[PDB]
PDB file of C-alpha atoms in Angstrom:
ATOM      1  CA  UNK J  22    -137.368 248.308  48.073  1.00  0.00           C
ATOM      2  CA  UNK J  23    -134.856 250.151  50.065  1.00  0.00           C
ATOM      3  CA  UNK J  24    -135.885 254.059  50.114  1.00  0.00           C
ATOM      4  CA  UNK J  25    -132.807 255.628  51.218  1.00  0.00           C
ATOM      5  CA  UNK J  26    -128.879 254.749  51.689  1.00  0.00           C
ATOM      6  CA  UNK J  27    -126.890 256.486  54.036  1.00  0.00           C
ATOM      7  CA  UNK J  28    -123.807 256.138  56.417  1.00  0.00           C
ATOM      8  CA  UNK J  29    -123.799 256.716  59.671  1.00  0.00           C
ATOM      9  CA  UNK J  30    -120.442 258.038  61.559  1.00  0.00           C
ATOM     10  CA  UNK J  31    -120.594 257.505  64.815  1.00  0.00           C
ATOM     11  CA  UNK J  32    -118.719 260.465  67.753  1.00  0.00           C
ATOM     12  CA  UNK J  33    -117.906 260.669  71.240  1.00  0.00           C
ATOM     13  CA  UNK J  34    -120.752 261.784  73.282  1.00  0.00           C
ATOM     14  CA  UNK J  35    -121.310 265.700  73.433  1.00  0.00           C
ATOM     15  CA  UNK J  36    -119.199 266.188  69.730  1.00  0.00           C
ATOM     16  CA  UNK J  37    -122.012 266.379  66.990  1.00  0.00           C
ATOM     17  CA  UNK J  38    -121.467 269.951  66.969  1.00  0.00           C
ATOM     18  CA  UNK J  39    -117.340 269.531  67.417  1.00  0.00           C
ATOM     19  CA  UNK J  40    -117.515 267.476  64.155  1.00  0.00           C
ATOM     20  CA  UNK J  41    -119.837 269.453  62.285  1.00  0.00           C
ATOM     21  CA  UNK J  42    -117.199 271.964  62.407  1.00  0.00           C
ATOM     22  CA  UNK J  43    -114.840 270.131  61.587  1.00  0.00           C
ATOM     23  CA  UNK J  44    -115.843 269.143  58.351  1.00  0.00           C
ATOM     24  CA  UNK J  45    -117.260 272.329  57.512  1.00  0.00           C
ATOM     25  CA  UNK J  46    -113.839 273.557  58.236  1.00  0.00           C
ATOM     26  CA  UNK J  47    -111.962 271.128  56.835  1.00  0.00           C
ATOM     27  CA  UNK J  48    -113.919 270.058  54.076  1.00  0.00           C
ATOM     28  CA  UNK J  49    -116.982 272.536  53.092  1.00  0.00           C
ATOM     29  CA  UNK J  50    -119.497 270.288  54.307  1.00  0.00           C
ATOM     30  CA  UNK J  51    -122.680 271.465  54.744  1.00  0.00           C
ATOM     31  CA  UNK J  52    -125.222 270.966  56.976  1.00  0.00           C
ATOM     32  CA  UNK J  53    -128.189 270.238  55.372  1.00  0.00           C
ATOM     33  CA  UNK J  54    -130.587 269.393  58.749  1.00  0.00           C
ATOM     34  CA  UNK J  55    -129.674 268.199  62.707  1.00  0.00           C
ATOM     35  CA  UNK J  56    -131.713 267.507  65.200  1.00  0.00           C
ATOM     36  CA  UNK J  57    -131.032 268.699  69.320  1.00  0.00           C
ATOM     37  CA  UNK J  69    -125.788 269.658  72.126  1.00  0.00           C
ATOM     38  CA  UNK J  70    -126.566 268.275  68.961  1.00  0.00           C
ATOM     39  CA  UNK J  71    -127.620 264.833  68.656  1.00  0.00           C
ATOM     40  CA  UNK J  72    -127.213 264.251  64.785  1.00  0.00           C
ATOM     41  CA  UNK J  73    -126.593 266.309  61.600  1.00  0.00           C
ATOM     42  CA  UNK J  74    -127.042 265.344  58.121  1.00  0.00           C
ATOM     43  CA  UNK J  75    -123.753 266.752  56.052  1.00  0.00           C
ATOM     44  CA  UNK J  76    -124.226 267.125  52.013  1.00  0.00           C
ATOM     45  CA  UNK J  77    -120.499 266.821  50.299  1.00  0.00           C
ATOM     46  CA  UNK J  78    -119.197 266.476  47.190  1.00  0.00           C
ATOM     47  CA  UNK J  79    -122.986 264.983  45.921  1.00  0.00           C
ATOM     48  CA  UNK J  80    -123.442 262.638  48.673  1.00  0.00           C
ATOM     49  CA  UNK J  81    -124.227 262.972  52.241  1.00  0.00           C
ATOM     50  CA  UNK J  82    -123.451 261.334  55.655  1.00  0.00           C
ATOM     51  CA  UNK J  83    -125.100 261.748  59.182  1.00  0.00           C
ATOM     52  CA  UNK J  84    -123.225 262.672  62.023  1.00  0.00           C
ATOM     53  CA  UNK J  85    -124.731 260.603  65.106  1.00  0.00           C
ATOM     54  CA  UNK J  86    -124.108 261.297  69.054  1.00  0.00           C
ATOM     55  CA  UNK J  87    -122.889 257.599  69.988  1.00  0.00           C
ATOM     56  CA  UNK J  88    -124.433 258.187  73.568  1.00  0.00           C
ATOM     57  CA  UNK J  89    -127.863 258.004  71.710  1.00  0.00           C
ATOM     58  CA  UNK J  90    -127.320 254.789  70.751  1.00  0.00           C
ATOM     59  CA  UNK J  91    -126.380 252.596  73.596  1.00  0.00           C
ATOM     60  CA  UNK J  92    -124.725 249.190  72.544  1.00  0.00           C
ATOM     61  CA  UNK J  93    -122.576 250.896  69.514  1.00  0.00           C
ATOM     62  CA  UNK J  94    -119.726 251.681  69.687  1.00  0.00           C
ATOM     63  CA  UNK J  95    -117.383 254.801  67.853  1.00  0.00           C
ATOM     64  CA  UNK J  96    -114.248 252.169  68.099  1.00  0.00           C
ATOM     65  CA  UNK J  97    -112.062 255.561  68.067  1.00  0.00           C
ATOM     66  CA  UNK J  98    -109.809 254.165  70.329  1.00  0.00           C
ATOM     67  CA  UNK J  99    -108.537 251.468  68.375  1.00  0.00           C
ATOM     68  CA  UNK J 100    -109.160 252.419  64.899  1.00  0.00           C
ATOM     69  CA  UNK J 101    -112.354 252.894  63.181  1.00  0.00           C
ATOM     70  CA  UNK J 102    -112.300 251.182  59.489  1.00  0.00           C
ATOM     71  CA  UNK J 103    -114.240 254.231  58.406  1.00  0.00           C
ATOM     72  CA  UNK J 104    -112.650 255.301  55.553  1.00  0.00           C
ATOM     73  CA  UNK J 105    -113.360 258.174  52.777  1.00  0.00           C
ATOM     74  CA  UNK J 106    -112.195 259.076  49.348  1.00  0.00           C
ATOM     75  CA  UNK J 107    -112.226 262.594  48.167  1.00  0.00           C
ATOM     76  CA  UNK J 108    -111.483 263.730  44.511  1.00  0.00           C
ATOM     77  CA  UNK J 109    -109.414 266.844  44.289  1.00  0.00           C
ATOM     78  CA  UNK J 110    -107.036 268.852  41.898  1.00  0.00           C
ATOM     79  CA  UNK J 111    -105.031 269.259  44.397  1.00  0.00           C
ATOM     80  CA  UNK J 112    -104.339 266.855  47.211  1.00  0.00           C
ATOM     81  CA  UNK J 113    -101.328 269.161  48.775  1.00  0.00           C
ATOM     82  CA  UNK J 114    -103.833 271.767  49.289  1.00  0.00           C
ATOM     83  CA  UNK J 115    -106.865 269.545  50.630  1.00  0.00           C
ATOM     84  CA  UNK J 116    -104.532 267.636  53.215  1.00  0.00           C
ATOM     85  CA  UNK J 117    -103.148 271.474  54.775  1.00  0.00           C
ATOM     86  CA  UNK J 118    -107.143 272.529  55.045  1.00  0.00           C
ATOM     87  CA  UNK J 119    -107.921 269.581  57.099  1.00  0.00           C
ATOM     88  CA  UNK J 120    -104.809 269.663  59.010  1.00  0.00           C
ATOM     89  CA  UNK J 121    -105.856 273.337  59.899  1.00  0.00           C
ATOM     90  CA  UNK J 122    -108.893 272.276  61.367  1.00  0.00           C
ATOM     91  CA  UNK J 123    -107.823 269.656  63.280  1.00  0.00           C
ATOM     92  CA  UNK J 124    -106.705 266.481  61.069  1.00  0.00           C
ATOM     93  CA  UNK J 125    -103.494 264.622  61.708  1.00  0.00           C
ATOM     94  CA  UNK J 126    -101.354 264.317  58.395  1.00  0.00           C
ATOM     95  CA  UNK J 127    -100.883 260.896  56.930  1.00  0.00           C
ATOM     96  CA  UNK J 128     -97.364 260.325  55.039  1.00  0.00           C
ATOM     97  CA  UNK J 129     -98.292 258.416  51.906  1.00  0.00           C
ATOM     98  CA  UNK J 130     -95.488 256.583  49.921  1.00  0.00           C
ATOM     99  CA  UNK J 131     -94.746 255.844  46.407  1.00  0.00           C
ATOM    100  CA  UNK J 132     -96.475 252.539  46.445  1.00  0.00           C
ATOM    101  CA  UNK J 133     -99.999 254.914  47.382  1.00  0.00           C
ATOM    102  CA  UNK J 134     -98.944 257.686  44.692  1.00  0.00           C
ATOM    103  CA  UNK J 135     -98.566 255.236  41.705  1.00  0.00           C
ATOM    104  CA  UNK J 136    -102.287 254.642  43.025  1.00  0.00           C
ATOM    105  CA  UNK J 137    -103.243 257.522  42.799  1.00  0.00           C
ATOM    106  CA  UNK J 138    -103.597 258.225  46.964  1.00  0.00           C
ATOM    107  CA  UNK J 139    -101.607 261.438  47.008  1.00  0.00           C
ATOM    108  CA  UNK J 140    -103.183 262.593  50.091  1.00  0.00           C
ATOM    109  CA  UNK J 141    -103.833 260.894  53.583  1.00  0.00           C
ATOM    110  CA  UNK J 142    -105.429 262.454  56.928  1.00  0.00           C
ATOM    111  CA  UNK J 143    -106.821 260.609  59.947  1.00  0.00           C
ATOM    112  CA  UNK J 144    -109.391 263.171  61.595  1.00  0.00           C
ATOM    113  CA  UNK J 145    -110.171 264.076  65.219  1.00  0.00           C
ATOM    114  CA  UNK J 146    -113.241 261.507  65.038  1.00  0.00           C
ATOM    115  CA  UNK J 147    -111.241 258.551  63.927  1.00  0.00           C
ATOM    116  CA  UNK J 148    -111.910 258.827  59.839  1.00  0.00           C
ATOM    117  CA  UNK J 149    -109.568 258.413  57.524  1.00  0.00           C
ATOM    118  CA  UNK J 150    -109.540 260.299  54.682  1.00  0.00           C
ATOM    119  CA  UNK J 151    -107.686 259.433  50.928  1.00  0.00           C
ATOM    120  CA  UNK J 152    -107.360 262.479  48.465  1.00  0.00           C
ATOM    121  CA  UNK J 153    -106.895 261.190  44.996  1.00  0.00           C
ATOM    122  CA  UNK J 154    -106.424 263.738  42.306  1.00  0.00           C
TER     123      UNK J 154
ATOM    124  CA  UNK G  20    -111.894 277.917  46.982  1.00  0.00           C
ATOM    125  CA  UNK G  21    -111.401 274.034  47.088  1.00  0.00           C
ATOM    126  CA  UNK G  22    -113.716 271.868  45.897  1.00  0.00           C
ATOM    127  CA  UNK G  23    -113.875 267.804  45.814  1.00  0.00           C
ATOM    128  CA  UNK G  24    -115.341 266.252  42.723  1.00  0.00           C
ATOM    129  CA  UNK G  25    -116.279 262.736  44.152  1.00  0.00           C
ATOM    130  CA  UNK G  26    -116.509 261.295  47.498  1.00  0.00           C
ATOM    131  CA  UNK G  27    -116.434 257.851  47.641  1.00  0.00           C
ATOM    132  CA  UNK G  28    -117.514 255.746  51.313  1.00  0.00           C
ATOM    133  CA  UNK G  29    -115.551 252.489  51.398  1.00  0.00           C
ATOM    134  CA  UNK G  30    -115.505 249.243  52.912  1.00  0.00           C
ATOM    135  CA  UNK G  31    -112.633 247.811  53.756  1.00  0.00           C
ATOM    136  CA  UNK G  32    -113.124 244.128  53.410  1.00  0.00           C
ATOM    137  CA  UNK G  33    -110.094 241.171  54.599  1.00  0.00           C
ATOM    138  CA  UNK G  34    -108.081 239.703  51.569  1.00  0.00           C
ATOM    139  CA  UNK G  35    -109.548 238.037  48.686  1.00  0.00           C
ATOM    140  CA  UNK G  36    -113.228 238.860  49.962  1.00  0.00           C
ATOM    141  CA  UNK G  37    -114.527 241.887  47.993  1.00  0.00           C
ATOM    142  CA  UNK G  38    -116.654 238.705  46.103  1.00  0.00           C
ATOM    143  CA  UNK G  39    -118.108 237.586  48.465  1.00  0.00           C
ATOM    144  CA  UNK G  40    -119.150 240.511  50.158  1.00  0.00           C
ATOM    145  CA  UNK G  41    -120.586 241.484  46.748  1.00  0.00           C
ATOM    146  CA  UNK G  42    -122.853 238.238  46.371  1.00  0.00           C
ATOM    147  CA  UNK G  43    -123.473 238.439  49.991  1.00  0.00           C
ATOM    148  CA  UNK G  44    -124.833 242.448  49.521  1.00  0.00           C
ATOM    149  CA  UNK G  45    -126.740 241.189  46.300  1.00  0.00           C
ATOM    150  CA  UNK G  46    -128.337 238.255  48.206  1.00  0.00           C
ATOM    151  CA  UNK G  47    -129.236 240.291  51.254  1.00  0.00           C
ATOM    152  CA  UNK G  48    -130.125 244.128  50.299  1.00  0.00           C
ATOM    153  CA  UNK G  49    -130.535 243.521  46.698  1.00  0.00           C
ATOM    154  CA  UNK G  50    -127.380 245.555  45.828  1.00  0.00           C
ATOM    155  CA  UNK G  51    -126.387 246.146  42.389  1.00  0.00           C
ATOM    156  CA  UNK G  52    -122.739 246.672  40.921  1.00  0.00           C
ATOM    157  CA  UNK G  53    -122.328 249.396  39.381  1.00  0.00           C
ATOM    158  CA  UNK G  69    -104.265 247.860  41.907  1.00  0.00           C
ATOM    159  CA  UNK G  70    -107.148 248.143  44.126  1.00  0.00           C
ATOM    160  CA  UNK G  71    -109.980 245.073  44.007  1.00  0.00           C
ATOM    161  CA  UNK G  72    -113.118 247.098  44.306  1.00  0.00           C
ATOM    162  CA  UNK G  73    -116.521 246.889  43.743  1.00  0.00           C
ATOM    163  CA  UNK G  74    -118.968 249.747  43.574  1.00  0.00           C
ATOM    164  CA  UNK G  75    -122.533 249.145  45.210  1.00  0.00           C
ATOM    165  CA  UNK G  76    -125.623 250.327  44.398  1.00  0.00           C
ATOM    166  CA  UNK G  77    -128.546 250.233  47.109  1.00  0.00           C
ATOM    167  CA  UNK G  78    -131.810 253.244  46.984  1.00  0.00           C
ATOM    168  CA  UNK G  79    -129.977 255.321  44.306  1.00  0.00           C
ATOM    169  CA  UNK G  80    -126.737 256.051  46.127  1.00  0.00           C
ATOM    170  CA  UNK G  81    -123.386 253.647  46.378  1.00  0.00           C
ATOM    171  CA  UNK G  82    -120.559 252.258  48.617  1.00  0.00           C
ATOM    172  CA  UNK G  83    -117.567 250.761  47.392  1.00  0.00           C
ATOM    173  CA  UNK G  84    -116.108 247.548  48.788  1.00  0.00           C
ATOM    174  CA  UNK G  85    -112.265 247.594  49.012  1.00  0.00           C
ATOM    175  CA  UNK G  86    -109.696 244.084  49.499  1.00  0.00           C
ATOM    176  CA  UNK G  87    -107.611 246.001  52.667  1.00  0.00           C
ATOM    177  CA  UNK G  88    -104.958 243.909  50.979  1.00  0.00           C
ATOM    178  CA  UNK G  89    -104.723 245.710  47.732  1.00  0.00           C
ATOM    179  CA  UNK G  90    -104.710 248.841  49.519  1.00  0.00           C
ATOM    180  CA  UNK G  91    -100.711 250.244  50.390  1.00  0.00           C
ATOM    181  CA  UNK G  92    -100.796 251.911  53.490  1.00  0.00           C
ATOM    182  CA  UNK G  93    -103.674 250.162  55.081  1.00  0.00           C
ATOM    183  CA  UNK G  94    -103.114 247.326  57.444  1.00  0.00           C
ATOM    184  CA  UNK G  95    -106.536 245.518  58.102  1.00  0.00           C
ATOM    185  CA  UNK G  96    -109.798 246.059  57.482  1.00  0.00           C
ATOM    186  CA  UNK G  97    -110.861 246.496  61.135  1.00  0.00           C
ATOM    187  CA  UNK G  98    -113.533 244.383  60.501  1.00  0.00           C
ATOM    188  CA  UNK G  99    -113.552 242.806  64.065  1.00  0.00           C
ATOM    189  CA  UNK G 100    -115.103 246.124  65.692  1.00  0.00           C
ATOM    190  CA  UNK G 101    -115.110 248.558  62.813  1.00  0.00           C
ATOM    191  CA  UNK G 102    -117.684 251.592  63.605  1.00  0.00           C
ATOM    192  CA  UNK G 103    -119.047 251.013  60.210  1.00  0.00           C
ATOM    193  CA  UNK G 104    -122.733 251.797  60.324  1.00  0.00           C
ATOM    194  CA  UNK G 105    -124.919 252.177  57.312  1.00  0.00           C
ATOM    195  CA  UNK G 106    -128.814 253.067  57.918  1.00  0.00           C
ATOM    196  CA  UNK G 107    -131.710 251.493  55.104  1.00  0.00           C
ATOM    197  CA  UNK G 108    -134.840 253.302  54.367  1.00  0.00           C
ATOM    198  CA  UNK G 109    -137.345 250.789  53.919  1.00  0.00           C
ATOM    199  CA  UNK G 110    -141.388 250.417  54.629  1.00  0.00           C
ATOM    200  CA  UNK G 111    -141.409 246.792  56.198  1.00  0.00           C
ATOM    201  CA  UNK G 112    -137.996 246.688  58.460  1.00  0.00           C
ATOM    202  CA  UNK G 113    -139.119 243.197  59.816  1.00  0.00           C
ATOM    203  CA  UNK G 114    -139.037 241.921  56.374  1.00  0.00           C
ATOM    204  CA  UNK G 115    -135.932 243.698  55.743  1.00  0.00           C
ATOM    205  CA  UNK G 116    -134.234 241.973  58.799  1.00  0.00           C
ATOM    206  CA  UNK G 117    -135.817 238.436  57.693  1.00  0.00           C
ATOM    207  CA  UNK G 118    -134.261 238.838  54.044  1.00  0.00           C
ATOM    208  CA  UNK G 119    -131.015 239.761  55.568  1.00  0.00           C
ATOM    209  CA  UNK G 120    -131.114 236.800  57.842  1.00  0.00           C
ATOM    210  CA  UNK G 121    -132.081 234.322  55.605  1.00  0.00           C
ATOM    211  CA  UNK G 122    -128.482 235.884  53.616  1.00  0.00           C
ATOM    212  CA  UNK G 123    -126.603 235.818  56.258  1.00  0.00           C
ATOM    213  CA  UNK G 124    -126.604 238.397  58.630  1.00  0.00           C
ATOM    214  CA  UNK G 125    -127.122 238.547  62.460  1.00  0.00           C
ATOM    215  CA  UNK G 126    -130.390 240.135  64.251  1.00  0.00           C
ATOM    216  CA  UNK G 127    -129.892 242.391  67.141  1.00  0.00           C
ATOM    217  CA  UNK G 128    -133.153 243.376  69.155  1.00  0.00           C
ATOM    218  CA  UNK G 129    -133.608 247.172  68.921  1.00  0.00           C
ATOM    219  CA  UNK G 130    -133.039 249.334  71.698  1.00  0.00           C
ATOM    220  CA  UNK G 131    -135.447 251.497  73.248  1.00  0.00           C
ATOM    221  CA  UNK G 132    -133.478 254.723  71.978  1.00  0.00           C
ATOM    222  CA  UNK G 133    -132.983 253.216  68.750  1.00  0.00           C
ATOM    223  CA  UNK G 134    -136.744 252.412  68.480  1.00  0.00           C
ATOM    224  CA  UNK G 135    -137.514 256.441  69.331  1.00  0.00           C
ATOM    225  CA  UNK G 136    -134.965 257.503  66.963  1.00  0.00           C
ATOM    226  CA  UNK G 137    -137.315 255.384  64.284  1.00  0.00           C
ATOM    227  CA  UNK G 138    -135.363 252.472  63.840  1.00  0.00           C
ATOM    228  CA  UNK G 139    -137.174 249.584  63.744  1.00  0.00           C
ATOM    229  CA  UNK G 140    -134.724 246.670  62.281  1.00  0.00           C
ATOM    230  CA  UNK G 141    -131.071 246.290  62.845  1.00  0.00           C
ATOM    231  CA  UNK G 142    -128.293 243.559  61.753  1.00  0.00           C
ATOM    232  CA  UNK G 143    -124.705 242.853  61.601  1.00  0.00           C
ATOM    233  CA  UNK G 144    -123.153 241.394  58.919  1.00  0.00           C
ATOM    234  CA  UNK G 145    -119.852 238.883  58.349  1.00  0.00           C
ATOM    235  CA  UNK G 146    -118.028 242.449  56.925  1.00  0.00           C
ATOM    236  CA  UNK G 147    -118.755 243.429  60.255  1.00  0.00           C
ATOM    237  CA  UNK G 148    -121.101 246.637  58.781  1.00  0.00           C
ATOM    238  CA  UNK G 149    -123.486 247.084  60.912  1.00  0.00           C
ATOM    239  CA  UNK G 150    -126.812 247.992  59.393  1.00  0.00           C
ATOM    240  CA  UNK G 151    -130.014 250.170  60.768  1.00  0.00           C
ATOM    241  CA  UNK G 152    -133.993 249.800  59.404  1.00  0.00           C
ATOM    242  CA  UNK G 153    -135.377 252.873  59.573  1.00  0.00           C
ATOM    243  CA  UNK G 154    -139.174 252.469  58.997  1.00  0.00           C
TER     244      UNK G 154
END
């Protein structure tokens, strides 16, 4: 019996707080708990949650920011024009997606400053 | 205000393996189920979806080599957790001392290259 599911996203050392701002920004996260710099935050969203996690807590992991993290998010939105310019506001990089992603429904890409990419399907 | 109505976490998984990343999940967590090849998982009352990279435009792999993905497992018996896992498939790494004070007490990695936490 498995009491409790969660991902873990993984941040440079020093940037719990940094990214907890970010997706409040960017995304209306909230925070629903952290503990102490911050070393982790728990982040409700959209019914779910994630956890936020200082990498320089847990030696031998690694945030693979560098060369591309596969951790990747879907967000449902009625408007994935508006949700991409929010999170390019505070801080994401715009992804152009093409026809082949909008006949899928992926109308809205971002990668953000802690390596996540993000798909906004409306 | 803007608002998001779902928010899905994904796997990307390499071509033609969502499958057997399914049956592997089932066989090792217990996982339940329930264009883009997908398959929704179910583990503790929450869910992950597990995505063929291949089906997905726009995406090149799956980064599954040295992805960051990292998924943590409430459970009361994390040694038997790890056991299970192994006996499925996965690989045991020895906790850490700052994992171990952080309460995690079991951790694997798996041939999706997630990497998964026991947190007793």
């Amino acid at each position: 019996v498995f009491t409790e599911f969660k991902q873990m996203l993984l941040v440079e050392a020093q940037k719990v707080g940094d990214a907890v701002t970010f997706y409040k920004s960017a995304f209306g996260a909230i925070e629903s708990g952290h503990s102490l710099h911050v070393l982790s935050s728990e982040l409700n969203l959209a019914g779910s949650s994630f956890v936020v996690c200082d990498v320089s807590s847990l030696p031998g992991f690694s945030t693979a920011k560098s060369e591309g993290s596969g951790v990747t998010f879907l967000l449902g939105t009625k408007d994935a024009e508006a949700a991409v310019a929010k999170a390019v506001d505070a801080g994401a990089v715009k992804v152009e997606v093409t026809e082949a992603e909008v006949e899928l429904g992926f109308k809205g890409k971002v990668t953000d400053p802690f390596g996540v990419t993000w798909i906004f399907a409306e």
